[PDB]
Design a protein around this ligand. Structure first.
Ligand code: NCA
Length: 279
């Protein structure tokens, strides 16, 4: 399948070269998989989600996304126009308030929630979690991410936006999850992207168009935007049967475009997420 005039990041993940604008993908499109977006919520009524999104948990007085960040990330995973995996099921877990903030205790509870809740959901092709959040190093936060992964969920986490080594941030620094840095449309490391040996992969993160609250759209930047590209890619590949939750991060690294990014510090992987789709 081909989506013409797609957001640059979608085109990038199906291309061996920068500078193209069509996204190519197998029409299965992540059907039968599920992606949990652990964030500020998801505006599930957005036409872009087509009934495939639902809120399943909140830790606040409402499950509504009053911020937009979670809705944007969910759109990059799985919206019809802006999403990698256009037929996946999206589940919202609101661990962040409408200012985008959350206590580590709440974030941990949300991860443990997903590890169990996937057993209430029909996800025959597999389960992914997208975590576009983090703060300073916490062994308890890293442990929770490790448990979520161990339970059979492909965990993709943002490296962070400090232009610093991600070893000092959580859950970015948990080795067993998939830690995602950000790139721009010219194949440069995004100016704010964290780096370091803990990174597994880069995805598009600068100037990413996706869904927003109020039934709208906007372009924003962050490792928060790169992470759902990788989460959606994992769901897409799991639906194709090419990999599993336990092996998808390694598979994405194995099949990535290699050596094509600029300003990658020595010791950080030079790997850009790629779907290897051939029509
Ligand atoms: N995808 C590519 O063209 C490429 C270029 C250089 C090294 N590895 C891969």
């Amino acid at each position: 399948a081909a989506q013409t005039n797609a957001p640059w990041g979608l085109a990038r993940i199906s291309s061996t070269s920068p500078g193209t604008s069509t996204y190519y993908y197998d029409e299965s499109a992540g059907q039968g998989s599920c992606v949990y977006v652990i964030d500020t919520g998801i505006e599930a009524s957005h036409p872009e989600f087509e009934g495939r999104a639902q809120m399943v948990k909140t830790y606040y007085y409402s499950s509504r996304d009053g911020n937009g960040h979670g809705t944007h990330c969910a759109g990059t995973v799985g919206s019809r126009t802006y999403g990698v995996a256009k037929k996946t099921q999206l589940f919202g877990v609101k661990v962040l308030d409408d200012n985008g903030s959350g206590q580590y205790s709440t974030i941990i509870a949300g991860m443990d929630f997903v590890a169990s809740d996937k057993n209430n959901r029909n996800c025959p092709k597999g389960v992914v979690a997208s975590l576009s959040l983090g703060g300073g190093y916490s062994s308890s936060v890293n442990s929770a991410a490790a448990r979520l992964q161990s339970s059979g969920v492909m965990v993709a986490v943002a490296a962070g936006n400090n232009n610093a080594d991600a070893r000092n941030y959580s859950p970015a620094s948990e080795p067993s999850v998939c830690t995602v840095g950000a790139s721009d449309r010219y194949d440069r490391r995004s100016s704010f992207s964290n780096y370091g040996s803990v990174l597994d992969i880069f995805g598009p993160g600068t100037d990413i168009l996706s869904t927003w609250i109020g039934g709208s759209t906007r372009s924003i930047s962050g490792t928060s935007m790169a992470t759902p590209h990788v989460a959606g890619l994992a769901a897409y590949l799991m639906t194709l049967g090419k990999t599993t939750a336990a092996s998808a991060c390694r598979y994405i690294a194995d099949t990535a475009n290699k050596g094509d990014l600029s300003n990658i510090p020595f010791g950080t992987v030079n790997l850009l997420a790629y779907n290897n789709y051939q029509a």
